[PDB]
Write an enzyme that holds these catalytic residues in place. Sequence first.
Site, mmCIF file in Angstrom:
data_model
loop_
_atom_site.group_PDB
_atom_site.id
_atom_site.type_symbol
_atom_site.label_atom_id
_atom_site.label_comp_id
_atom_site.label_asym_id
_atom_site.label_seq_id
_atom_site.Cartn_x
_atom_site.Cartn_y
_atom_site.Cartn_z
ATOM 1 N N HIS A 61 -15.906 -0.639 -2.410
ATOM 2 C CA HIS A 61 -14.631 0.113 -2.435
ATOM 3 C C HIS A 61 -13.456 -0.711 -2.938
ATOM 4 O O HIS A 61 -12.489 -0.148 -3.429
ATOM 5 C CB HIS A 61 -14.258 0.819 -1.108
ATOM 6 C CG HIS A 61 -14.543 0.047 0.141
ATOM 7 N ND1 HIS A 61 -13.590 -0.712 0.792
ATOM 8 C CD2 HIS A 61 -15.652 -0.001 0.913
ATOM 9 C CE1 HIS A 61 -14.119 -1.229 1.887
ATOM 10 N NE2 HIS A 61 -15.372 -0.823 1.975
ATOM 11 N N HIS A 91 -6.960 -7.626 -0.235
ATOM 12 C CA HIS A 91 -7.601 -6.817 -1.269
ATOM 13 C C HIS A 91 -6.511 -5.990 -1.932
ATOM 14 O O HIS A 91 -5.320 -6.013 -1.515
ATOM 15 C CB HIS A 91 -8.637 -5.877 -0.672
ATOM 16 C CG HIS A 91 -8.063 -4.923 0.304
ATOM 17 N ND1 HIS A 91 -7.806 -5.286 1.599
ATOM 18 C CD2 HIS A 91 -7.662 -3.635 0.185
ATOM 19 C CE1 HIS A 91 -7.263 -4.277 2.241
ATOM 20 N NE2 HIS A 91 -7.145 -3.274 1.399
ATOM 21 N N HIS A 93 -5.656 -2.048 -4.069
ATOM 22 C CA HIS A 93 -5.943 -0.680 -4.517
ATOM 23 C C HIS A 93 -5.293 -0.464 -5.871
ATOM 24 O O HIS A 93 -4.177 -0.914 -6.101
ATOM 25 C CB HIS A 93 -5.422 0.350 -3.512
ATOM 26 C CG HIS A 93 -5.889 0.093 -2.124
ATOM 27 N ND1 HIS A 93 -6.965 0.762 -1.584
ATOM 28 C CD2 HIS A 93 -5.499 -0.817 -1.201
ATOM 29 C CE1 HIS A 93 -7.199 0.304 -0.370
ATOM 30 N NE2 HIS A 93 -6.329 -0.649 -0.116
ATOM 31 N N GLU A 103 -1.076 3.017 -2.759
ATOM 32 C CA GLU A 103 -1.315 3.887 -1.624
ATOM 33 C C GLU A 103 0.003 4.371 -1.083
ATOM 34 O O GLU A 103 0.248 5.572 -1.102
ATOM 35 C CB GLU A 103 -2.167 3.152 -0.574
ATOM 36 C CG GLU A 103 -3.542 2.853 -1.134
ATOM 37 C CD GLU A 103 -4.602 2.704 -0.096
ATOM 38 O OE1 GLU A 103 -4.456 1.859 0.806
ATOM 39 O OE2 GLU A 103 -5.597 3.428 -0.202
ATOM 40 N N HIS A 116 -2.861 -5.571 -0.219
ATOM 41 C CA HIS A 116 -2.831 -5.572 1.240
ATOM 42 C C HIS A 116 -3.344 -6.885 1.782
ATOM 43 O O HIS A 116 -4.493 -7.223 1.543
ATOM 44 C CB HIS A 116 -3.694 -4.445 1.775
ATOM 45 C CG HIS A 116 -3.115 -3.100 1.493
ATOM 46 N ND1 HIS A 116 -3.848 -1.941 1.512
ATOM 47 C CD2 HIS A 116 -1.860 -2.734 1.146
ATOM 48 C CE1 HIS A 116 -3.074 -0.915 1.233
ATOM 49 N NE2 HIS A 116 -1.862 -1.369 1.003
ATOM 50 N N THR A 195 -6.273 2.498 5.822
ATOM 51 C CA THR A 195 -6.278 3.525 4.761
ATOM 52 C C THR A 195 -7.668 3.831 4.246
ATOM 53 O O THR A 195 -7.809 4.688 3.377
ATOM 54 C CB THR A 195 -5.388 3.114 3.569
ATOM 55 O OG1 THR A 195 -5.983 1.980 2.905
ATOM 56 C CG2 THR A 195 -3.965 2.812 4.064
HETATM 57 C C1 LIG Z 1 -14.668 -2.951 11.902
HETATM 58 C C2 LIG Z 1 -13.922 -1.743 11.363
HETATM 59 C C3 LIG Z 1 -12.553 -2.061 10.753
HETATM 60 C C4 LIG Z 1 -12.600 -2.012 9.251
HETATM 61 C C5 LIG Z 1 -11.270 -2.429 8.615
HETATM 62 N N1 LIG Z 1 -11.385 -3.708 7.914
HETATM 63 S S1 LIG Z 1 -10.110 -4.358 7.179
HETATM 64 O O1 LIG Z 1 -10.647 -5.647 6.861
HETATM 65 O O2 LIG Z 1 -9.146 -4.325 8.204
HETATM 66 C C6 LIG Z 1 -9.688 -3.387 5.949
HETATM 67 C C7 LIG Z 1 -8.376 -2.888 5.867
HETATM 68 C C8 LIG Z 1 -7.990 -2.005 4.838
HETATM 69 S S2 LIG Z 1 -6.420 -1.459 4.792
HETATM 70 N N2 LIG Z 1 -6.111 -0.729 3.421
HETATM 71 O O3 LIG Z 1 -5.501 -2.554 4.999
HETATM 72 O O4 LIG Z 1 -6.274 -0.417 5.760
HETATM 73 C C9 LIG Z 1 -8.951 -1.652 3.857
HETATM 74 C C10 LIG Z 1 -10.273 -2.118 3.903
HETATM 75 C C11 LIG Z 1 -10.678 -2.958 4.932
HETATM 76 C C12 LIG Z 1 -12.065 -3.473 4.906
HETATM 77 O O5 LIG Z 1 -12.943 -3.107 5.809
HETATM 78 O O6 LIG Z 1 -12.348 -4.282 4.067
HETATM 79 ZN ZN LIG Z 2 -5.901 -1.615 1.698
#
Ligand SMILES: CCCCCNS(=O)(=O)c1cc(S(N)(=O)=O)ccc1C(=O)O
Ligand SMILES: [Zn+2]
Length: 257
Positions: A61, A91, A93, A103, A116, A195
């Site tokens: 993703h 990462h 978007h 976003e 982010h 998100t």
């Molecule tokens: C264990 C379940 C939580 C998953 C969220 N992981 S994250 O590292 O916080 C994350 C945040 C975001 S975001 N856009 O900051 O909400 C996007 C992707 C991920 C990811 O899983 O890589």
């Molecule tokens: Zn993000």
Amino acid sequence: HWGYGKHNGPEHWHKDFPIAKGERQSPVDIDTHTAKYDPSLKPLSVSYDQATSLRILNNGHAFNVEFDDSQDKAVLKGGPLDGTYRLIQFHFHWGSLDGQGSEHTVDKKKYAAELHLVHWNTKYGDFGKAVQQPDGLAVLGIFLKVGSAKPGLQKVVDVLDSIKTKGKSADFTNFDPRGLLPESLDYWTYPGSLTTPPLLECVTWIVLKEPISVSSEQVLKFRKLNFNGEGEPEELMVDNWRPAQPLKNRQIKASFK
Ligand SMILES: CCCCCNS(=O)(=O)c1cc(S(N)(=O)=O)ccc1C(=O)O
Ligand SMILES: [Zn+2]
């Protein structure tokens, strides 16, 4: 499974993740005229001098640049936050073209991309515990516009050929995320969510007002990544953004007059 296509995109996510229609979902449109200056907000404290990057991963993703978060090394404090939040990954978007990809939007303006930087609250001990709490994460959001190249981004751009497809990773040490920040740390802030699925309502969002500029060539290389795994039909990793969600009973606060 979930993704960004016609058949599994943001409008479908609620079926597996009902919180998708919740009370504090992200992203949102930031109405600049309605966001109120909050003089009680502090300057952000971004302390990234001791950041230890380890690896870069195509997760199907986006791509994540991962940090060593086993100690307080790179932390976010101050602003709207109580306590200490540890950097775990960043990462982006982005869009298929320069006119979309962010976003968050600013008075309905979509930027070409959005960075982010994800941090977790160290009073919860680990990341998996933090995402279960309303103040578990702090995500620093930074808009990207296309113009001049960002020198601090090129190391990321140049490793992307080695993680083209889902599940590929590469060593990515000694990357300094201070090279991705704009000059000003003026920000908007509001309570929100992840998100992506699982869309957990665990995020204090801090969205910087000043975009960074990246080059057309830089963002074009993001768009050569693949959502698919190796050998599978090529689906370009583009338009991996969730659209703005209803603000509901929330106020966006500005750090600046
Ligand atoms: C264990 C379940 C939580 C998953 C969220 N992981 S994250 O590292 O916080 C994350 C945040 C975001 S975001 N856009 O900051 O909400 C996007 C992707 C991920 C990811 O899983 O890589
Ligand atoms: Zn993000």
